[PDB]
């Protein structure tokens, strides 16, 4: 049973009966020989797991996973190089250099970095913006490569500058409702942007607010020019891949290393396209012969930095958020301490080295990481084998992809959109849960469809921040009362036999009071008390001025009258003199001790007040700002001058220690109004009144 | 003394011992004859105070205040029409039509609407943007008037659309730190923009990111062309007005209706400029003769709506925020119910009627409202007399301002910048108070100086919203303990003789848990408990799998061994099989009842745990979202499967009623874990353990 027999404490009788107990530059600038061995081995993390490498139980699994992710990285390299309007050889450069740099500088053991379609589509939008903003067949796709490389270099520089300044916690402003709303709209963007390769149409590059319908108009105005031999091949590839992926999602009994339908269908499509001369019989958009070898490095152009300095921030944000959210899943499994700041440095170095050698930007993909982890990827040596496969495709076997339809690539990339399109079926899962994150989802989807991918992310983040203000805009403030003659105080409109003491009003605001809900708090407090205290103070001051005017006239003196009725000379105060009606009342010059409650002398009318104390339950108020401290001080000054005691209960110690440095406590609003709980304020009032 | 002898309640034993107690379209669509008389008399509020008009005590004071504000409105009309590059006659139209419309449609009794310099400067920027974006001496200032009228019409339409949709609470996103940071930067903008009239220079219109230094470069590159006869006159006017304003701020004894130095200095300057032929002796920039009469109305141009649709939103926001913050001061005095939604409708109608008749936009000014209220303005009839004065200046006495220097106007408008420039001396008043609103002030000032007035307001609002996330990003989570063997639980690192029970950990997070602080909450909870529970669950599952493998081999059977030492066959789990290490443990198929704490059989190693229950004090957690509910459910599922009881205390009723519709409670995380306070959870643990 709950038995308590303590005295009544009031936060100053408690702090005197139980006694309590440069700034950062001398702990962060101490050059020690034990700290450099931590800093270097956390900056260059290949010296930490490569000596501690269990060879005999990991090498074969890493080799198998490396081959099985290198084939997928080759097939996804020259398929994401079509979302950018560059030749498809520049997609193989994008999946080789970051996989080499992340081997030396990365912390995650299970992701395989390369390109992934949302970031390559954002790069494809930014390069068309840089082309359309620059001052003055093969000469068009030269400046596309030369500007995509510079967009990649600038995004890597931004990511490296994030990683050096140790701001790796920027992923927490990217809640999963915003990610789930951005991802389906990016999937719709991919599905629309890959229509011009299935139908084999010619679409000009659009870079504007809404461009998901400009591409739709430019495609659907020339449906009569659709190559049937490309559409039939893309439809045949698309329904086989979905059926075999459905079979691979089910049927997982006696089935190790599930059947790769993408590689098999690509081999079959390339063999058919070579054997029957599909470039000459029909007229298809075949992937031409790539130059065997790498390209010499280019200097990044300066005039395209100043044109796309806004899009590279969004590219860096998306490339860090995706590569953190994917890697944290495999970090919760296997229990390794993934470091957020080193990921930005590794991805920035990988993107810089990729952009110097004419690649394009990218981070890890969810499907390639799932292929690398599901087939037994133990460490990042599988990424090295996956990069060696792309190296041997670039150097030697480049002619084997020369009879590739370029519509089977767009059909394969439309294959695994079902993972990002099923999240449409969660709005109903969010409508019956919060109705604020459903709003965040809907507004993120609308802003990403309409305002593109660069501006839509910033607009959805700015709305996600406004949602938190919407949550605490109109709090459900209530009035409390006692249940069962004990220390249980709950809401008055809930239980039956609640007892409320005489002249005590316990008020509770269940939200942190800041600038958007201080006026609402004041209005709700005035409506719950029953009067405005400034109105009663002004009427009391008017009555006191009339009383002392009658005393100066020689009528009053307790307070006996001479005549029964006087004239009702309502001396109204003009401007620049009405501010004396807000002054505190002093009755030291009078012999009587008026209380403004029983009655007054002749034709003096003052509204009555039954209160003598109110209690503010501030147990849920988390913080205050200058506007709340100013408004709260203005409220308590009206409540104290009206002879009503105020108590603020339920606060802990650093709340009072923060309120000390707000110039809150003066000779009127003393520091002895803070009590511990609600019940020892009611007990203090009851032991003070009698 | 505090004596309590209640039983121990657990939010389900409490709700069964004390029994408790279309949606809005049928209360908002009820056409009643008593509701129309409220709606019309709140929409057309001149029918409410004009019959209730105490004539014999208000008429003379309203006439005096009307004359004294009409002179100031005339002198401020054709001085704010120089911040826009229009002829000065179009400033007298801006202070006449809104004062007539606000008489019929306004609620405040003490503001005098007209132009005010921040909004006219924003109009002057937007009109230059509309000129510089339009496709193709007197022909330049024709399109300035024709585009400023359309910017005014669009801003009035936006304000009227705000007032009809009843969103009049948008001023609460405009905290006083943001207003105080925006106002001084607007004052610096006014002081720089009025330099070309003192020196009498020719400056082209700049409309861009940063333009406070483009005007400074265009002025200070041609200092050698400064008219000395204008600079000397502006300096003579400027130091007299400041001295007499200092004398008027002090010396307020036997001094009614303080001496207007602006009208006297304007009369003296005009008389000197006429008597000595200042347009011919020197070569000054005198205010030319205005056409006597109004202008016929124009249709607003459509092509300039689409160019400045972004700036008109900022003009409407500033025009509502200033006219609300000024009117609320005189609404707190005199006690009248000012309505926020009617102010938007009245200002929108005033701006529309002003923009049709070739005026420009505006709301009330602080100085004109102070002049109208301080001289005895009782109602809005003083605004009507102030408009009649502007009418008689436009119609008849227009030649009296024709010898006006146009540098004395810029010198007068630099006079009362001291009210908006002294707020520089509050950063030190905000540095020792919060250091978040000092940051809001500094970032608002920097964004308004750099990004102009239109974009700077939006950027400072977007940073003000981010400040609230910065306040609750890293909360100061703590561990509590008991003081003095009673129901007082406070922070463990504060007091000396705090007692903590055996195996109980009371944890407290003093912030609402949302998406930005759920990972920090999980990391702080794991660091305060002392272990990760998923690690102990995985090691317990590995040990249990080894135990049952030894049982299948025929060695174990309580739990006696056969041999002393076995081989250390560490059967490590591959991928797609390691997720069985997170499953709950069941020991129903074993005869023994292992507890994972004392010891285990041969070479089995499990980490020990001293906990058996932890308590989460959620009294300060105001709300949750889907990310917090998901992460909290994931935390409690690890803590329950490890055989550690969890209790969540300090929550009130609608917190549990909200958590019901989150799919939070299942067969594992039952609803019986919620307790009332901290002490009756500790008492429940102590009465359950023995
Ligand atoms: C939820 C909503 C309110 C958020 C804000 C949406 C706006 C950002 C969208 C909605 C309508 C859009 C406009 C709809 C149509 C057009 C015409 C379009 O014209 C062309 O592409 C050229 C046509 C030609 O040259 O003939 C240019 C973009 C624009 C202005 C769009 C710009 C982006 C707008 C303003
Ligand atoms: C806000 C969401 C929910 C709906 C979006 C509706 C509109 C904003 C969209 C739908 C149809 C779109 C239009 C569809 C086709 C075109 C043609 C397109 O191409 C041209 O005009 C090329 C030049 C020419 O041929 O004249 C320019 C964009 C435009 C006007 C689009 C502008 C944006 C529009 C009006
Ligand atoms: C804290 C985050 C938001 C990054 C820091 C702010 C950036 C958004 C700013 C700071 C430096 C700025 C740059 C400073 C100088 C220039 C050169 C300038 O070159 C010109 O040709 C001038 C005329 C013009 O293009 O407007 C173009 C803008 C640019 C790249 C600016 C683009 C915007 C930048 C990158
Ligand atoms: C958000 C924070 C952590 C980012 C910190 C880094 C940025 C402040 C720097 C990194 C690289 C900088 C860029 C490096 C080079 C240039 C080119 C420079 O071009 C010129 O001056 C034009 C010269 C010419 O046209 O001849 C304009 C600034 C800009 C875009 C810089 C803008 C500022 C950037 C993005
Ligand atoms: C606190 C800071 C980081 C906030 C972001 C600041 C930017 C929005 C500012 C800082 C530097 C500014 C730039 C500094 C100089 C110029 C050159 C200026 O050039 C001209 O006016 C034309 C010159 C010519 O024609 O010769 C155009 C604006 C611009 C790009 C400014 C645009 C606005 C910028 C990028
Ligand atoms: C961010 C805050 C704290 C400091 C701001 C520093 C810069 C962003 C400012 C200071 C000096 C400014 C410059 C001062 C003078 C000019 C000349 C001005 O006029 C012309 O160039 C006209 C055409 C010509 O004559 O070439 C254009 C803006 C510019 C470059 C300004 C651009 C913005 C600058 C670099
Ligand atoms: C909820 C708040 C933020 C207001 C609602 C959204 C507005 C910001 C949008 C909705 C309608 C939009 C307008 C819809 C159509 C047009 C015509 C369009 O005309 C053109 O010549 C098209 C090409 C172009 O200028 O880009 C110019 C943009 C404009 C005015 C748009 C400007 C932006 C507007 C006002
Ligand atoms: C924030 C919410 C509450 C505002 C609600 C009102 C707006 C949605 C409306 C009110 C007036 C509208 C404007 C009225 C007229 C026009 C002109 C119109 O011009 C054309 O279509 C061009 C025709 C041509 O060039 O021939 C473009 C949209 C625009 C700016 C409209 C944009 C949308 C506005 C601002
Ligand atoms: N598992 C696997 O081998 N693959 C995929 O999952 C692919 C996708 O459709 C992706 C959509 C978003 C990221 S990947 C894919 C595409 C090609 Cl061209 C070759 C192989 C592929
Ligand atoms: N009280 C008064 O009569 N006046 C002022 O206060 C003036 C200002 O400087 C203002 C600065 C911001 C708003 S007003 C002012 C200017 C002129 Cl041209 C004529 C009279 C004036």
UniProtKB/Swiss-Prot annotation, chains A, B:
Expressed in the colon. Expression is significantly decreased in adenomas (polyps) and adenocarcinomas of the colon. N-glycosylation is required for efficient cell surface expression, and protection from proteolytic degradation. It comes from the Eukaryota. It is a multi-pass membrane protein. Gene3D superfamilies: STAS domain (3.30.750.24). Inhibited by acidic pH. Residues 1-62, 107-110, 166, 248-311, 365-380, 460-666 are cytoplasmic. The keyword DNA-binding does not apply. Pfam families: STAS, Sulfate_transp. It is linked to Diarrhea 1, secretory chloride, congenital: A disease characterized by voluminous watery stools containing an excess of chloride. The children with this disease are often premature. Interacts with CFTR, SLC26A6 and NHERF1. Interacts with PDZK1. Interacts (via PDZ-binding motif) with NHERF4 (via the third PDZ domain); interaction leads to decreased expression of SLC26A3 on the cell membrane resulting in its reduced exchanger activity. This is Chloride anion exchanger. It comes from Homo sapiens (Human).
């Amino acid at each position: 049973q709950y038995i308590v027999a303590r005295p009544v404490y009031s936060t100053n009788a408690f702090e005197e009966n139980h006694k309590k107990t440069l700034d950062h530059l001398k702990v962060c600038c101490s050059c020690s020989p034990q700290k450099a061995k931590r800093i270097v081995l956390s900056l260059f993390p290949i010296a930490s797991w490569l000596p501690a490498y269990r060879l005999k139980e990991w090498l074969l699994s890493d080799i198998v996973s490396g081959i099985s992710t290198g084939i997928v990285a080759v097939l996804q390299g020259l398929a994401f190089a079509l979302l950018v309007d560059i030749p498809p050889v520049y997609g193989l450069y994008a999946s080789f250099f970051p996989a080499i740099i992340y081997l030396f500088f990365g912390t995650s053991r299970h992701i395989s970095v390369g390109p992934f379609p949302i970031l390559s589509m954002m790069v494809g939008l930014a390069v068309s913006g840089a082309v359309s903003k620059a001052v003055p067949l093969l000469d068009d796709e030269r400046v596309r490569v030369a500007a995509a490389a510079s967009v990649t270099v600038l995004s890597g520089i931004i990511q490296l500058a994030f990683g050096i300044l140790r701001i790796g916690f920027v992923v927490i402003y990217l809640s999963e409702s915003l990610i789930s709303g951005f991802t389906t709209a990016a999937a719709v963007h991919v599905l629309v942007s890959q229509l011009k390769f299935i139908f084999q149409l010619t679409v000009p590059s659009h870079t504007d607010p809404v461009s998901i319908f400009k591409v739709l108009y430019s495609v659907f105005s020339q449906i009569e020019k659709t190559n049937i031999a490309d559409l039939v091949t893309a439809l045949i590839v698309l329904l086989v891949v979905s059926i075999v992926k459905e079979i691979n999602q089910r049927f997982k009994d006696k089935l190790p290393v599930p059947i790769p339908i993408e590689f098999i269908m690509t081999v079959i499509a390339a063999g058919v396209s070579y054997g029957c001369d599909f470039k000459n019989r029909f007229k298809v958009a075949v992937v031409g012969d790539m130059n065997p070898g790498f390209q010499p490095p280019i200097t990044p152009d300066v005039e395209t930095f100043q044109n796309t300095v806004g899009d590279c921030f969004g590219i860096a944000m998306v490339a860090f958020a995706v590569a953190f959210s994917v890697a944290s899943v495999y970090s919760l499994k296997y229990d390794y301490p993934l470091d957020g700041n080193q990921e930005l440095i590794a991805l920035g170095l990988g993107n810089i080295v990729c952009g110097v050698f004419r690649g394009f930007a990218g981070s890890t993909a969810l499907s390639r990481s799932a292929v690398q982890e599901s087939t037994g990827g133990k460490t990042q040596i599988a990424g090295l084998i996956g990069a060696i496969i792309v190296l041997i495709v670039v150097l030697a076997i480049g002619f084997l992809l020369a009879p590739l339809q370029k519509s089977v690539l767009a059909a394969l990339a439309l294959g695994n959109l079902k993972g990002m399109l099923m999240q449409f079926a969660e709005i109903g899962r969010l409508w019956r849960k919060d109705k604020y994150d459903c709003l965040i989802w809907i507004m993120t989807f609308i802003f990403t469809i309409v305002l593109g991918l660069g501006l839509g992310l910033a607009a959805s983040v700015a709305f996600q921040l406004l949602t938190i203000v919407f949550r605490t805009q109109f709090p459900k403030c209530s009035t409390l009362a006692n249940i069962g003659r004990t220390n249980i105080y709950k809401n008055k409109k809930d239980y039956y036999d609640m007892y409320e003491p005489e002249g005590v009003k316990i008020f509770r605001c269940p939200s942190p009071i800041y600038f958007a809900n201080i006026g609402f708090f004041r209005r709700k407090l005035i409506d719950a008390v029953g009067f405005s205290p400034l109105r009663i103070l002004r009427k009391r001051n008017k009555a006191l001025r009339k009383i002392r005017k009658l005393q100066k006239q020689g009528l009053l003196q307790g307070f006996i009258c001479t005549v029964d009725t006087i004239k009702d000379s309502d001396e109204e105060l003009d401007n620049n003199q009405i501010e004396v009606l807000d002054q505190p009342i002093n009755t030291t010059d009078l012999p009587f001790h008026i209380d403004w409650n029983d009655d007054l002398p002749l034709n003096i009318e003052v509204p009555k007040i039954s209160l003598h104390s109110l209690i503010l339950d501030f147990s849920a108020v988390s913080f205050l700002d200058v506007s709340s401290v100013r408004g709260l001080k203005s409220i308590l000054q009206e409540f104290i001058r009206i002879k009503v005691d105020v108590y603020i209960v339920g606060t802990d110690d650093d709340f009072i220690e923060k309120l000390n440095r707000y110039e809150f406590f003066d000779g009127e609003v003393k520091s002895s109004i803070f009590f511990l709980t609600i019940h020892d304020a009611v007990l203090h009032i009851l032991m003070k009144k009698d």
